[PDB]
Amino acid sequence: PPHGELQYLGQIQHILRCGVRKDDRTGTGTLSVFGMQARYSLRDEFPLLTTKRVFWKGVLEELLWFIKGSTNAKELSSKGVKIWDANGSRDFLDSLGFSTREEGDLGPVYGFQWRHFGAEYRDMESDYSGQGVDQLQRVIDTIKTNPDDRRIIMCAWNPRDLPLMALPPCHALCQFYVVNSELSCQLYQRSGDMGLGVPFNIASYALLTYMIAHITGLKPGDFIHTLGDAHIYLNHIEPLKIQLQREPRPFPKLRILRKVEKIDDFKAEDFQIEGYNPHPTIKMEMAV
Amino acid sequence: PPHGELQYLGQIQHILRCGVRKDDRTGTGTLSVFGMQARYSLRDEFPLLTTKRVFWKGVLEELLWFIKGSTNAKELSSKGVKIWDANGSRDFLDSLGFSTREEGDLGPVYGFQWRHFGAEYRDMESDYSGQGVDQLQRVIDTIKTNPDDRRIIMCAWNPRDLPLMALPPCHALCQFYVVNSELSCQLYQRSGDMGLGVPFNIASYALLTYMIAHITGLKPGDFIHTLGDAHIYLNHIEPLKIQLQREPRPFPKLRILRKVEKIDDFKAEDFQIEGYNPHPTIKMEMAV
């Protein structure tokens, strides 16, 4: 049965063969399937794709930025990771009616929701200590005290806060699961740019699972990737067909370099990707 | 093309063969798999399971109760549907520390979240008109004005309100999708009692999709059922093996008997299940 990267490549094939033409906001157009699911083992391997190089630096710095609760694009940008900068620009903020908002202030996105769900958002520089639900720490506490729990959820989709966000979250929610000393994670991704977003998104949530497993004394299990609108932008078709011709190399491994006690204490240098031997980057133009 | 019900029966088989032993609060125990997905066509058929009779009256009355925004178990009970009554009882409310709460008051569950997400909950008798986000109406409006939208979400998972609820929602969220004049729906169900809950849950969201398609002038497409902890209670194993001997009968059809303009105007007598030929109920004791 296909395993690891062949799940992702199988999804690409399925959308090319069975996807339906579907317009989008950008006017680019897509081939689209609604509802997919892939399973990536995390057991002695880390699912960083090898058929094209994934932006691992971006994955790791973005995740650390989420964990600290930041909603400031400038703070991620300062680390050489520019993926949120367009959505924090003066022009983009004004386009949403946020003329009074400071440049970089993404509103109550991921970081805020994860650490302060339900608090009143003010700006990206405010102190939210003790405010709202700390979903991330509550996930960790539940795994430690009640691993059988079937409500181990972290949700970024906050209908009250959506109008203030720079972008509605794509990763609406995730759920953790423990059995036989293994930690698994399922992501509900409402919308997946299969060429540009999804490889990165797989790595983010696999990383998060490695982090939480390390904190809780468990072994990584599976990452289950569930998609809503799974789509290939029309201008990614030829690049993806090039990618599909490449034979995958074995996944790398991820090493955590020291014992870390609290999720907030992880730093970028604590992580080491080993044996990563990807084929070259394939240029895929982003839609918006 | 295979009967859609064989997806469900395939899931039962997979859990019996590959599910792992996993304890629960009741001490019943389960066999459990994390992460499953099935697709049920809604095109000229309604996926009301035939290998054991589904409580259709319960499906329909519960859904109408959700749509009106109710959080009062007594109001559902009055229609002959007792499925929430134990969770609203004096005893159960007291067991959660809700000694001051009136009997029947489930707290900010589905109905409240769907129609008033983010409003302040008081009690089951309060007027919430105009308060919070009406997710249900916003879903319907978006389908009508911008069908390509990839953010058509209704979320019941509200971390701020969880501690007031009689039970945390199993149906954490759902997402709608439109292509070629067909409306599809995906449910993220965090926890699935495969014997007792899941058949009912499939029917609820298929129904909701039929309702919203009727309101918006679209044809029903697919229902995609995604599970988190998909589990068989140990005392359902033998009953389910009896069920697995049965060949499915062709699915019924669902007829909507008049033109209805607003989701709030649907009544129970507007719906007719046609050609439903289930095998008999098999007794499966619920875990408490």
Ligand SMILES: CN(Cc1cnc2nc(N)nc(N)c2n1)c1ccc(C(=O)N[C@@H](CCC(=O)O)C(=O)O)cc1
């Ligand atoms: C998670 N994320 C957001 C993302 C992904 N796909 C999208 N696709 C579309 N159509 N629209 C989006 N806003 C979008 N956003 C990402 C992730 C990576 C990069 C990125 O493409 N490239 C690095 C790579 C640099 C390197 O490896 O040397 C960069 O140049 O910013 C962009 C956005």
Ligand SMILES: CN(Cc1cnc2nc(N)nc(N)c2n1)c1ccc(C(=O)N[C@@H](CCC(=O)O)C(=O)O)cc1
């Ligand atoms: C969806 N749902 C809630 C549900 C399902 N499985 C669960 N399973 C567990 N372990 N715990 C729960 N709280 C639970 N809740 C249901 C659905 C049907 C019935 C049920 O008992 N139906 C009828 C059948 C009667 C008829 O056909 O007219 C009844 O006798 O009440 C109960 C709960």
Ligand SMILES: O=c1ccn([C@H]2C[C@H](O)[C@@H](COP(=O)(O)O)O2)c(=O)[nH]1
């Ligand atoms: O982490 C992310 C962020 C965005 N996207 C995608 C999906 C869509 O192509 C686009 C978002 O647009 P909307 O779904 O909100 O229309 O970027 C991803 O795949 N991953």
Ligand SMILES: O=c1ccn([C@H]2C[C@H](O)[C@@H](COP(=O)(O)O)O2)c(=O)[nH]1
């Ligand atoms: O609509 C519903 C409501 C509940 N359950 C199940 C799943 C679990 O077996 C139990 C709820 O318990 P927790 O997952 O919250 O532990 O009832 C369903 O399958 N469907």
